[PDB]
Amino acid sequence: KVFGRCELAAAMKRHGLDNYRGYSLGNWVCAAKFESNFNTQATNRNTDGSTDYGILQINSRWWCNDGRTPGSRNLCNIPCSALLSSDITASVNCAKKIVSDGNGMNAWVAWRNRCKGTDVQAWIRGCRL
Ligand code: NA
């Protein structure tokens, strides 16, 4: 599924991500924009041989199991394929654990490089939330 911006904002808000660990909804929508372009089916191979899955490009190195990431963890206890679903419940549940790990949203390099410090509320502008 390719989400609309306000459609994804609503879905994220509904699932308790707005101000989760102090991160406004605009931060999460900005991260999703530059990680996935709001595409639930997005996969990207990392140099280390791990893969990033779904709207928030969650890494198989730590968070999900893809069976092809030697020496990796599955801390969200989910198949990585569960992170490509049109229903964002599993990506959100797993993202709550990532953002809670100590470095907040810096875990998402695209968030740090492209969202952090910027006018993130622009990402929810005009949305009926
Ligand atoms: Na893994």
UniProtKB/Swiss-Prot annotation:
EC number: 3.2.1.17
Family per similarity comment: Belongs to the glycosyl hydrolase 22 family.
Tissue expr: In the egg white and polymorphonuclear leukocytes.
Location within or outside the cell: Secreted
Catalytic activity: Hydrolysis of (1->4)-beta-linkages between N-acetylmuramic acid and N-acetyl-D-glucosamine residues in a peptidoglycan and between N-acetyl-D-glucosamine residues in chitodextrins
CDD domains named among the record's database cross-references: LYZ_C (cd16897)
Organism annotation: Gallus gallus (Chicken)
Cited Gene3D superfamilies: 1.10.530.10
Subunit structure: Monomer.
Function: Lysozymes have primarily a bacteriolytic function; those in tissues and body fluids are associated with the monocyte-macrophage system and enhance the activity of immunoagents. Has bacteriolytic activity against M.luteus.
Protein name: Lysozyme C
